[PDB]
Design an enzyme around this catalytic site. Structure first.
Site, PDB file in Angstrom:
ATOM      1  N   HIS A 107      -5.185   1.259 -23.075  1.00 19.10           N
ATOM      2  CA  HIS A 107      -6.527   1.399 -22.317  1.00 19.10           C
ATOM      3  C   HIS A 107      -6.488   1.264 -20.837  1.00 19.10           C
ATOM      4  O   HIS A 107      -5.889   0.267 -20.315  1.00 19.10           O
ATOM      5  CB  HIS A 107      -7.491   0.176 -22.638  1.00 19.10           C
ATOM      6  CG  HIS A 107      -8.880   0.206 -22.453  1.00 19.10           C
ATOM      7  ND1 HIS A 107      -9.452  -0.626 -21.438  1.00 19.10           N
ATOM      8  CD2 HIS A 107      -9.772   0.921 -23.159  1.00 19.10           C
ATOM      9  CE1 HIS A 107     -10.648  -0.456 -21.508  1.00 19.10           C
ATOM     10  NE2 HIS A 107     -10.862   0.505 -22.572  1.00 19.10           N
ATOM     11  N   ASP A 119     -19.857   7.830 -12.672  1.00 17.57           N
ATOM     12  CA  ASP A 119     -19.000   7.567 -14.089  1.00 17.57           C
ATOM     13  C   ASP A 119     -20.043   7.654 -15.270  1.00 17.57           C
ATOM     14  O   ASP A 119     -21.134   7.221 -15.277  1.00 17.57           O
ATOM     15  CB  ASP A 119     -17.882   6.539 -14.333  1.00 17.57           C
ATOM     16  CG  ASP A 119     -18.337   5.302 -14.141  1.00 17.57           C
ATOM     17  OD1 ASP A 119     -18.480   4.780 -15.481  1.00 17.57           O
ATOM     18  OD2 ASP A 119     -18.797   4.729 -13.108  1.00 17.57           O
TER      19      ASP A 119
END
Lengths: 343, 343
Positions: B117, B175
């Protein structure tokens, strides 16, 4: 409603656009991109637009003698100056160059500078896919959307498109505008007194409404997200290209005698430059297959992969023809260039 | 909710990641991306995740001695084999190579192949914008979403980020997750018996619910749109890199001892190869300013440009330090590798 063969429709559109002024080579390219839209069920970008295109070509608002210039600025980048040529011509040309570049150097980012409306942009990314590459595309549009939490118009419905190759003839195509709904829909409900969902559009004050007559602007899809996407598309196909941007973008009815000056951005990626294209194609097909295998929720007969519904229509079309609203047909076979004016 | 300086927070995190088995330099990188997140109010990708990272580093689920390999495949393309190294480390490395490539060659597409991640992905596009370039990033994620009209999960919340340079230190950062809301939010209302908007999730039948305890999967933002978006992100940062894709993507809590094998794709564009970079920057700042001056709708004290709310928070944090939950703080200053296991 009537149905006609791709070829006859192509010729009717092509002849119409010639008659209005475009060189035949141009008229035929515009036509192919329109027939493409209609075969995929995207009528909003099909033959219904021919009359407005003819009016504009006729009045010099689309350049019939464009002075093209392909400015290569680096190994994988370039700008196609389109001198406000028909968007279909400009964009197809730009994408062809991108495909050429990506084929050789793995990647390509090509700008299309000053063009008219290019149509259903999924047509261009499908060019790339048919050539075996991933294709991404996006362009600016007429201002019609309020920013999130806003009451004035700023960005357009700025579409984004993507396509990637699967095995055989399989192509995955995804196309999307950044607003919940398209302005055309608001006009239809305007026609039939018909009312509309409170998510589509906002009023002059920025408050949503069900009254299409009270509508002042569209809403961005998924609020802050759609808003961010349309801004992004405006930055990539406008600001990056030194073109008008945001609320400066021209609108369809501003001046039929003046070029639109729109911008478009293509991105092409050659999978061979990242991993096996053979496994890439195999996995894209596998994706298609699995999604389509997924258990549907109540209210759904099946689960379709992105764009599959349009693929099915396109395939059927190549066999039974394309459905065209009778009035448009009558318009196409008549001698008029444009009955109702967009003046 | 204590309040500490980025410095203090960054050091604490770094130490704890070191104690777990990471090399100081990689931990430092992980910590800064995590502090970046908390400073922006993106707590879901901040220090709250140290404990889980410590436990996976400790069990080998994150390669502590990664053998990095940067395969330059062309003029503007490259793949960074990360060897299941920590995502923050790998993505930052990749982005660095991208920034350097676009600097020389105008454009760069770099894939990060097999990583864990990588946290708040906007961090990497910001790297590109600090360098004066346009940055776009996206990566795969833990399967949590049903397809449009589907009842089983396939894709994850697959995030997308973009950033572009304004005048001076100004940066426009955007984002977005492709789902309406994050799984974390389902947890909040769940951990406090609070009904939720029926647009976030669906029940085990694929029918949206209001009860968080009924939630089986998340819904894609704007229906078919986020659906196409997650697929695109999956094709670009997964299928393109020959990595597991769609439902194959590893879950966080599946196997703490196994590498996640995630992929990420960066795309960098050097405004200079397309037009005046100073004009570009000046236009981006104009975009920000004007969006801010837009008449807000009833119910908004003001109109923000994309990511402005997070921009504001970041600025303040660098002055007022960052807020941290007690549970998280006492864990960072204790000597434990972790107080609970994430299965």
């Amino acid at each position: 409603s009537s149905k006609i063969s791709r070829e006859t429709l192509h010729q009717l559109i092509e002849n119409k656009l010639c008659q209005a002024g475009l060189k035949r080579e141009h008229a035929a390219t515009v036509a192919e991109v329109l027939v493409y839209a209609d075969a995929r069920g995207i009528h909003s970008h099909g033959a219904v637009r021919v009359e407005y295109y003819a009016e504009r070509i006729s009045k010099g608002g689309t350049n019939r003698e464009p002075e093209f210039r392909l400015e290569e600025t680096g190994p994988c980048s370039a700008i196609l100056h389109a001198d406000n040529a028909a968007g279909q011509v400009a964009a197809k040309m730009g994408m062809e160059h991108a495909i050429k570049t990506a084929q050789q150097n793995g990647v390509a980012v090509v700008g299309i500078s000053r063009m008219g409306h290019s149509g259903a942009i999924s047509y261009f990314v499908q060019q790339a896919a048919r050539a075996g590459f991933i294709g991404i595309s996006m362009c600016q549009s007429d201002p019609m959307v309020v920013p999130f939490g806003g009451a004035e118009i700023y960005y357009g419905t700025n579409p984004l498109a993507f396509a990637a190759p699967g095995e055989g003839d399989e192509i995955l195509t995804f196309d999307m505008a950044t607003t919940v709904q398209a302005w055309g829909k608001v006009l239809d409900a305007r026609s039939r007194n018909m009312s509309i969902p409170d998510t589509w559009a906002v009023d002059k004050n920025g408050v949503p409404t069900t009254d299409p007559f009270a509508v002042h602007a569209l809403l961005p899809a998924a609020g802050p997200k759609g808003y961010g996407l349309m801004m992004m598309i405006d930055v990539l196909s406008g600001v990056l290209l030194g073109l008008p941007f945001g609320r400066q973008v021209s609108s369809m009815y501003d001046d039929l005698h003046a070029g639109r000056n729109l911008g478009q951005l293509h991105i092409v990626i050659n999978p061979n430059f990242f991993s096996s294209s053979e496994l890439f194609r195999q996995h894209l097909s596998q994706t298609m297959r699995e999604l389509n295998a997924i258990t549907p929720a109540p209210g759904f007969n099946q689960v379709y992969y992105p764009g599959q519904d349009q693929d099915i229509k396109q395939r059927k079309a190549a066999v039974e023809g394309i459905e065209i609203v009778d009035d448009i047909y009558q318009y196409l076979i008549s001698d008029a260039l444009y009955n109702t004016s967009y003046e």
